[PDB]
Design a protein around this nucleic acid. Structure first.
Length: 257
DNA sequence: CCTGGCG
DNA sequence: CGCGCAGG
């Protein structure tokens, strides 16, 4: 009895719907699908997206018209669904879906991009900070956590095609690479690295300069568990072939109880 | 129906 | 490049 979970930074759900989304969503059959950067409120989506037979859908849209936003489809509904950490700034941008699956917490997080500004960065890290204290509190409470989404940060050099030219860009800043160390040091396993240790494995590629076409990308989308849960995940992979976004989907699968 | 934020 | 958004 294995639970397949998919994360995807979708970059416009209305757009991905126009590029075969649902077709894939039913071909690939995941018990939980977490989507990030949805760029929509639910009343903007076609009913075909709001209502997917088999799945209860949940949407956390920002209070900024078609910006950010996370979503989730799921066969077995969560016992409850939290949408923020407890700080307005982070809570109001459709970035947080913590969904209690009475077995584990599934954290669907779209972490802030810090490319575009120093004050939008910073926000990214303070967001990171707010997330950690939170996940800590939950797994200290003995709750097992699965965290997926768009971290917007390559952890180590191996997590992007061109680390060296990228030292100064947000996404591979030593400041942000630091936090993931902290994050892991706090007892979280980068589930993908539990299986693959090869380079050139990515989940993001710049649209401009047609980067995807030749694998010149980054690994920004992650599946994480707590050390204590490491045992019960039996594959974290990357759906490198799924199209219609500058990111791509990443898969996990876990176990019964 | 084009065209000119964030990522 | 791509998404969406607003507003001529």
């Amino acid at each position: 009895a294995v639970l397949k979970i998919i994360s995807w930074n979708v970059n416009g759900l209305r757009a991905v719907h126009r590029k075969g989304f649902l077709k894939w969503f039913m071909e690939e059959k995941p018990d939980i699908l977490c989507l990030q950067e949805i760029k929509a409120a639910p009343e903007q989506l076609p009913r075909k997206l709001r209502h997917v037979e088999g799945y209860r859908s949940f949407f956390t849209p920002a209070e900024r018209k078609g910006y950010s936003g996370v979503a989730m489809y799921t066969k077995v509904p969560p016992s409850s669904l939290r949408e923020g950490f407890g700080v307005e700034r982070f809570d109001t941008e459709g970035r947080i879906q913590i969904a209690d699956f009475d077995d584990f917490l599934l954290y669907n997080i779209y972490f802030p991009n810090g490319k575009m500004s120093e004050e939008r960065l910073k926000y990214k890290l303070e967001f990171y900070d707010a997330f950690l204290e939170d996940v800590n509190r939950e797994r200290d409470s003995g709750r097992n956590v699965i965290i997926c989404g768009n971290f917007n940060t390559a952890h180590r050099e191996i997590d992007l095609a061109r680390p060296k030219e990228n030292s100064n860009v947000s996404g591979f800043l030593p400041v942000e690479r630091a936090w993931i160390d902290k994050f892991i040091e706090n007892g979280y396993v980068d589930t993908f690295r539990m299986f693959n240790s090869d380079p050139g494995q990515y989940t993001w590629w710049s649209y401009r300069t047609r980067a995807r076409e030749r694998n010149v990308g980054w690994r920004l989308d992650y599946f994480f568990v707590n050390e204590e849960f490491k045992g019960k995940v039996k594959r974290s992979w990357i759906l490198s072939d799924v199209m219609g976004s500058d990111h791509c989907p990443i898969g996990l699968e876990i176990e019964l109880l």
